[PDB]
Amino acid sequence: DIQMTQSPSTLSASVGDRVNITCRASQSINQWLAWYQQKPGKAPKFLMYKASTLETGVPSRFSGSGSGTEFTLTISSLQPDDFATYYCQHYFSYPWTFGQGTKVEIKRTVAAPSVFIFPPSDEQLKSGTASVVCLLNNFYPREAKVQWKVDNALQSGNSQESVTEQDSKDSTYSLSSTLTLSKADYEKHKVYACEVTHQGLSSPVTKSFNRGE
Amino acid sequence: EVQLLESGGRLVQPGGSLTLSCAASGFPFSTYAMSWLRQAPGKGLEWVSGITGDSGSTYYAASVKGRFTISRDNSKNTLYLQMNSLTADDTAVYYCAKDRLHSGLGELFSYWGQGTLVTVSSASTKGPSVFPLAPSTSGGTAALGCLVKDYFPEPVTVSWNSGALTSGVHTFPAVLQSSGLYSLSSVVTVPSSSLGTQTYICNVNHKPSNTKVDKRVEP
Amino acid sequence: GVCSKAFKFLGTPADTGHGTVVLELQYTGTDGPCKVPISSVASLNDLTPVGRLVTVNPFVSVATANAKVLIELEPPFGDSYIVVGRGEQQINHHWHKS
């Protein structure tokens, strides 16, 4: 079984840059290598075969090279239509194998998030459950830390995060963290807060609330 | 041009069975090799099986040999995938793919369908409960949303004002809670001055459970 | 089943003088006994067997690697192609008769 390995797994470039994506093989594959493109929530698109021959309709800014055990896909003028994840695939032996994928991300200026906190809805309270939501909107880059503090104490557990895809308008990210807690444990405390740390912040941003006020 | 439409993906309990179909249009289906591929949520691509078109040769990945069976009905332009002994590691989106050249071995995949979602779990189908996120915040604009919580399985589609609100709207990917139930949130930033004139409702749609809940958001 | 591994051409398709062509193929894979996918076609987009195969149903008899097999084919007069294999590694050899 040939194992395919792509490097890097993530590169951040601007519109107009020239980008290389490497894909290596464990064995020797003469030129039986293909390239695929996939945007989020969408099916893959066949881009190249033979490691250099473009599929019909693919823009000429895409090109490929490499033979034997190392291959590179090249995007000579990165367009917004090209930011996606790219997979390489071999067709040398029976078990067709894909690479890990490589996400090409839009690079932009650093932007601090806007942190919003939501107390549990009184409708959910009637179900015996209380969920606290901490929203981080339109920040760049993607790396960000959320810290739940109950009565200014480091609470850990029952907290899950979710990050949107890179926006197609302003190329930023958004984060959603939910602190799900039973109504019994929820009423046993007063202060609920999330402390947000981001690159564009010179100091942490804590959004808090008290039960009732 | 070419269209590959997959159907049959659903929720099944471990050890169960399921058959996938793929109706094809736009090319001489009889002379092109077809393939099934799968992609686990948030993971890489994986080849599953292929068939020659003449039904003279079939190929299977190592993890599915003896478990899966690929077939095709050329008179109906339909590809089939019989799946048995489904484990939890079979939970993935299964894609239908057309070979580049005719009379081939499925060596590569020149066109893909949108794929169908197959979920292998012991959990049962449950609709969600849509709880509101009241816009109390005050960063740049009014931040409000809805919380589609405790549903199973995927997927769920959320719209705002029946589609009349798309500027500055973020629907987050669902997270798998420890209880085996998914949960997501859909927020939208709107001018805080419009908190006394604009009515907001989320159009939550859970097709696996036949659910359609509209929740009014107010401060 | 059919041999799904690629073949290597040990010698160029030769002329016997009997109106037929002869080519010796080496089978790389070790997939056991399998049928040899060889056919004579008029073009590369419609694999209509316009040439009769003299060697009755060529076969890879042994289950080992690097097994050579001799195949005899009668191509039609004029332009023709000799196709060996399937998929992307399918080798097409243009032949011309009389």
Side-chain angles (χ1 to χ4, degrees):
Chain A
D1 292 19
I2 294 96
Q3 298 201 234
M4 311 303 306
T5 314
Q6 301 179 223
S7 51
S9 47
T10 296
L11 53 89
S12 188
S14 300
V15 182
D17 298 332
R18 183 149 59 194
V19 164
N20 289 134
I21 300 176
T22 313
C23 161
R24 302 183 169 106
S26 71
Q27 300 181 1
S28 183
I29 297 153
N30 310 329
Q31 265 161 326
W32 319 110
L33 185 99
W35 281 100
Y36 301 87
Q37 179 192 65
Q38 188 186 28
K39 313 196 79 174
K42 287 293 182 294
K45 175 203 272 289
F46 177 56
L47 288 192
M48 286 199 322
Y49 64 107
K50 254 293 182 63
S52 65
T53 297
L54 263 66
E55 174 64 283
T56 74
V58 179
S60 62
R61 60 187 186 264
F62 288 83
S63 59
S65 46
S67 300
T69 194
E70 188 171 27
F71 310 87
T72 57
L73 177 73
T74 307
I75 316 177
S76 62
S77 174
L78 204 49
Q79 299 295 121
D81 200 86
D82 303 327
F83 291 94
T85 297
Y86 292 79
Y87 302 85
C88 60
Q89 178 237 317
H90 80 85
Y91 47 102
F92 183 87
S93 170
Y94 278 167
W96 331 114
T97 301
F98 287 78
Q100 52 173 40
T102 290
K103 185 183 190 300
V104 178
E105 170 193 316
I106 314 174
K107 180 150 60 182
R108 71 176 304 272
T109 67
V110 177
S114 308
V115 184
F116 316 103
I117 187 162
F118 300 98
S121 57
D122 294 15
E123 306 174 3
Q124 182 189 18
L125 292 176
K126 301 186 304 179
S127 61
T129 307
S131 297
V132 190
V133 183
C134 189
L135 172 61
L136 292 65
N137 199 350
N138 297 131
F139 58 90
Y140 192 88
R142 184 186 163 103
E143 307 80 38
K145 255 49 193 174
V146 180
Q147 280 294 321
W148 285 109
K149 291 183 182 179
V150 183
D151 296 86
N152 288 276
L154 280 183
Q155 138 84 32
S156 188
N158 62 55
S159 53
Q160 292 173 131
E161 300 179 321
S162 185
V163 181
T164 50
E165 206 65 41
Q166 196 175 26
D167 191 309
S168 54
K169 291 177 293 295
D170 59 354
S171 299
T172 64
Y173 291 101
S174 288
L175 191 149
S176 176
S177 189
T178 306
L179 192 79
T180 304
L181 192 58
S182 70
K183 76 161 184 176
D185 293 354
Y186 177 75
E187 294 178 10
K188 288 198 292 283
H189 295 267
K190 183 174 179 60
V191 180
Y192 295 93
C194 49
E195 196 180 69
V196 166
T197 293
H198 190 252
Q199 189 179 329
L201 294 168
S202 58
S203 57
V205 175
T206 306
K207 256 55 175 55
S208 62
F209 70 93
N210 304 338
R211 297 197 300 105
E213 297 281 46
Chain B
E1 47 171 54
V2 179
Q3 283 186 17
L4 300 180
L5 316 177
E6 294 96 309
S7 57
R10 66 184 182 196
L11 168 64
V12 285
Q13 210 149 2
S17 304
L18 194 270
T19 301
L20 298 172
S21 71
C22 169
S25 73
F27 61 93
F29 185 82
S30 305
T31 66
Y32 272 88
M34 300 300 296
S35 284
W36 284 101
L37 297 85
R38 68 182 174 180
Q39 182 183 19
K43 308 304 162 59
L45 302 171
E46 181 181 13
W47 168 77
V48 178
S49 182
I51 191 172
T52 51
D54 311 300
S55 284
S57 302
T58 63
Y59 310 87
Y60 302 86
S63 63
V64 304
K65 289 177 181 178
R67 288 148 29 84
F68 288 4
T69 292
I70 189 175
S71 62
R72 64 151 63 209
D73 189 4
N74 278 332
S75 60
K76 276 72 182 177
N77 288 247
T78 307
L79 188 71
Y80 299 110
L81 180 58
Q82 164 81 313
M83 299 189 294
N84 292 336
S85 306
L86 293 183
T87 65
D89 288 357
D90 289 319
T91 301
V93 179
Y94 285 75
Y95 294 98
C96 190
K98 194 251 308 169
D99 204 358
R100 169 182 167 261
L101 291 188
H102 66 285
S103 315
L105 307 171
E107 301 173 359
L108 61 94
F109 326 100
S110 61
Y111 197 93
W112 302 57
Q114 288 228 48
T116 188
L117 181 59
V118 167
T119 304
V120 189
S121 170
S122 66
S124 301
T125 293
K126 183 201 174 188
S129 46
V130 185
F131 305 135
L133 296 179
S136 59
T137 66
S138 174
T141 29
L144 56 94
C146 296
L147 182 62
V148 186
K149 186 186 178 59
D150 299 320
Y151 71 96
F152 193 87
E154 280 272 82
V156 135
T157 58
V158 179
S159 305
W160 283 93
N161 290 14
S162 297
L165 176 53
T166 48
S167 178
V169 176
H170 301 277
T171 294
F172 295 82
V175 292
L176 191 56
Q177 303 172 122
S178 65
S179 65
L181 304 184
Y182 288 101
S183 181
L184 63 88
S185 33
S186 181
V187 295
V188 43
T189 35
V190 291
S192 51
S193 59
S194 56
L195 274 179
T197 170
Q198 189 76 6
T199 301
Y200 302 96
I201 55 179
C202 37
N203 297 78
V204 183
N205 191 308
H206 194 206
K207 295 185 64 180
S209 66
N210 309 95
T211 320
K212 180 68 174 57
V213 185
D214 300 359
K215 280 285 181 169
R216 306 150 192 79
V217 186
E218 54 179 343
Chain C
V2 186
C3 310
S4 308
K5 293 308 198 310
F7 294 84
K8 297 183 189 299
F9 45 100
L10 282 177
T12 200
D15 193 342
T16 36
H18 310 136
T20 62
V21 306
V22 173
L23 46 89
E24 197 177 37
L25 301 175
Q26 184 186 58
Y27 184 48
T28 59
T30 171
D31 315 357
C34 51
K35 308 163 184 176
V36 175
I38 180 170
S39 58
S40 172
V41 304
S43 283
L44 304 88
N45 53 328
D46 50 323
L47 278 78
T48 303
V50 297
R52 182 214 150 196
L53 202 53
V54 173
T55 295
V56 42
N57 295 85
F59 220 95
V60 178
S61 52
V62 304
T64 59
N66 301 283
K68 69 179 188 180
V69 279
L70 202 58
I71 290 87
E72 194 163 349
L73 181 147
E74 175 191 352
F77 292 86
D79 280 319
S80 179
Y81 293 89
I82 315 178
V83 177
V84 167
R86 294 184 299 185
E88 308 287 334
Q89 303 185 21
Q90 147 205 9
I91 44 178
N92 306 322
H93 200 338
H94 176 276
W95 183 261
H96 192 78
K97 180 177 183 177
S98 295

